[PDB]
Scaffold this active site. Structure first.
Site, mmCIF file in Angstrom:
data_model
loop_
_atom_site.group_PDB
_atom_site.id
_atom_site.type_symbol
_atom_site.label_atom_id
_atom_site.label_comp_id
_atom_site.label_asym_id
_atom_site.label_seq_id
_atom_site.Cartn_x
_atom_site.Cartn_y
_atom_site.Cartn_z
ATOM 1 N N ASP A 181 -24.380 -22.744 0.820
ATOM 2 C CA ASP A 181 -24.353 -21.186 0.837
ATOM 3 C C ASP A 181 -23.648 -20.953 -0.409
ATOM 4 O O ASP A 181 -23.960 -20.020 -1.114
ATOM 5 C CB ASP A 181 -23.820 -20.580 2.023
ATOM 6 C CG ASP A 181 -24.615 -20.289 3.289
ATOM 7 O OD1 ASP A 181 -24.275 -19.595 4.005
ATOM 8 O OD2 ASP A 181 -25.793 -20.449 3.017
ATOM 9 N N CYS A 215 -36.165 -18.285 -5.266
ATOM 10 C CA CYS A 215 -35.108 -18.502 -4.355
ATOM 11 C C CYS A 215 -34.862 -16.988 -3.744
ATOM 12 O O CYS A 215 -35.820 -16.423 -3.138
ATOM 13 C CB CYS A 215 -33.729 -18.921 -5.077
ATOM 14 S SG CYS A 215 -33.567 -17.955 -6.613
ATOM 15 N N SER A 216 -33.636 -16.345 -3.761
ATOM 16 C CA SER A 216 -33.523 -15.063 -3.354
ATOM 17 C C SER A 216 -33.692 -13.962 -4.416
ATOM 18 O O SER A 216 -34.800 -13.286 -4.410
ATOM 19 C CB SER A 216 -32.137 -14.600 -2.641
ATOM 20 O OG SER A 216 -32.217 -13.444 -1.981
ATOM 21 N N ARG A 221 -31.090 -20.646 -8.619
ATOM 22 C CA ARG A 221 -31.724 -21.871 -8.017
ATOM 23 C C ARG A 221 -33.007 -22.060 -8.704
ATOM 24 O O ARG A 221 -33.387 -23.271 -9.084
ATOM 25 C CB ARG A 221 -31.750 -22.076 -6.645
ATOM 26 C CG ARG A 221 -30.529 -21.964 -5.813
ATOM 27 C CD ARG A 221 -30.717 -21.565 -4.525
ATOM 28 N NE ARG A 221 -29.380 -21.414 -4.006
ATOM 29 C CZ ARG A 221 -29.110 -21.157 -2.753
ATOM 30 N NH1 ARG A 221 -30.159 -20.922 -1.988
ATOM 31 N NH2 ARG A 221 -27.929 -20.607 -2.017
ATOM 32 N N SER A 222 -33.744 -21.154 -8.797
ATOM 33 C CA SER A 222 -35.346 -21.300 -9.460
ATOM 34 C C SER A 222 -35.102 -21.682 -11.008
ATOM 35 O O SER A 222 -36.021 -22.532 -11.430
ATOM 36 C CB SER A 222 -36.056 -20.010 -9.347
ATOM 37 O OG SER A 222 -36.188 -19.562 -8.153
ATOM 38 N N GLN A 262 -27.792 -18.933 -12.975
ATOM 39 C CA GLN A 262 -26.481 -17.651 -12.552
ATOM 40 C C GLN A 262 -25.034 -17.876 -12.726
ATOM 41 O O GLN A 262 -24.260 -16.923 -12.920
ATOM 42 C CB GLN A 262 -26.870 -17.083 -11.422
ATOM 43 C CG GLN A 262 -27.789 -15.797 -11.193
ATOM 44 C CD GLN A 262 -28.316 -15.298 -9.413
ATOM 45 O OE1 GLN A 262 -28.721 -16.382 -8.635
ATOM 46 N NE2 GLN A 262 -27.919 -14.293 -9.285
#
Ligand SMILES: [Mg+2]
EC number: 3.1.3.48
Length: 283
Positions: A181, A215-216, A221-222, A262
């Site tokens: 998380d 991802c979101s 993460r992508s 990010q």
């Protein structure tokens, strides 16, 4: 190993945040005017994560061709990726329309539907074989065929049917389910293992459309997933593997979608994955 030396010295000098900020300053700024049209407000999950106009995937059905998704085409690596946001309650049919129209074979999902107690993504695929989903706005049917739940990830086979033409395609859903998380994984080992599973499926291969990665937001993460895959490809292809520069590859990818990687910790983790993946491949 050169890249391992640059890594170790950024670590000893605590320069990760400063290396990362310099990438943020040098990164491309291209217009995103379709993303910002008022008619597309509810097609965007985040106001500050938009696809550039020049690299955005366009839906083929006419009315509104907009989806928050970018084609990352890596020329030298001969690899393409579609990076997109986690589908919204309203954009699940668009998402699968894009998968259909781009002739994608794989969907790589790097988030859980709920993280940190909030919904990060719509439940855009069926969870039970006998309860298929129909997307009436894009006229597509989606059926769970099988799924294989492992410790770090889940692989699903799905059938996507164009209800208009009754054609059917098998889509593989690669779901990385253990990304913490907060922060990034302790060890790159399970992420690399996951990436090689995607590779071994054919989903990254040029006989298919680009893999769809989300991802979101579809950048953090992508970005890590595509950065590591492209860097390792380049190291296999080149006369001089140590000539592969993660930072220059990242900046090339950022010509196609903003914000990839990010955090400075995600940057450090990408270096880590490429370095350890280099041992397991090119060792
Ligand atoms: Mg059952």
């Amino acid at each position: 190993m050169e890249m391992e030396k640059e890594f170790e010295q950024i670590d000893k000098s605590g320069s990760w945040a400063a290396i990362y900020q310099d990438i943020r300053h040098e990164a491309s700024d291209f217009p995103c005017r379709v993303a910002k049209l008022p008619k597309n407000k509810n097609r965007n999950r985040y106001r500050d994560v938009s696809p550039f106009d020049h690299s955005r995937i366009k839906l083929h059905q006419e009315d509104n061709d907009y989806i928050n998704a970018s084609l990352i085409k890596m020329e030298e690596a001969q690899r393409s990726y579609i990076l997109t946001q986690g589908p919204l309650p309203n954009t699940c049919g668009h998402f699968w329309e894009m998968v259909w129209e781009q002739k994608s074979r794989g969907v790589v999902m790097l988030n859980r539907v709920m993280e940190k107690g909030s919904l990060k993504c719509a439940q855009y695929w069926p969870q039970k074989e006998e309860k298929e989903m129909i997307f009436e706005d894009t006229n597509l049917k989606l059926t769970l065929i099988s799924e294989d739940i492992k410790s770090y990830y889940t692989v699903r086979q799905l059938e996507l049917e164009n209800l208009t033409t009754q054609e059917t395609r098998e889509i593989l859903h690669f779901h990385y389910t253990t990304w913490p998380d907060f922060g990034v994984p302790e060890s790159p080992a399970s992420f690399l293992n996951f990436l090689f599973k995607v590779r071994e499926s054919g989903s990254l291969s040029p006989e298919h459309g680009p893999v769809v990665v989300h991802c979101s937001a579809g950048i953090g993460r992508s970005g890590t997933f595509c950065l590591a895959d492209t860097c390792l490809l380049l190291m296999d292809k080149r006369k001089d593997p140590s000539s592969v520069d993660i930072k220059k590859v990242l900046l090339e990818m950022r010509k196609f979608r903003m914000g990839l990687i990010q955090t400075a910790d995600q940057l450090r983790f990408s270096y880590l994955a490429v370095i350890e993946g280099a041992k397991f491949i090119m060792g």
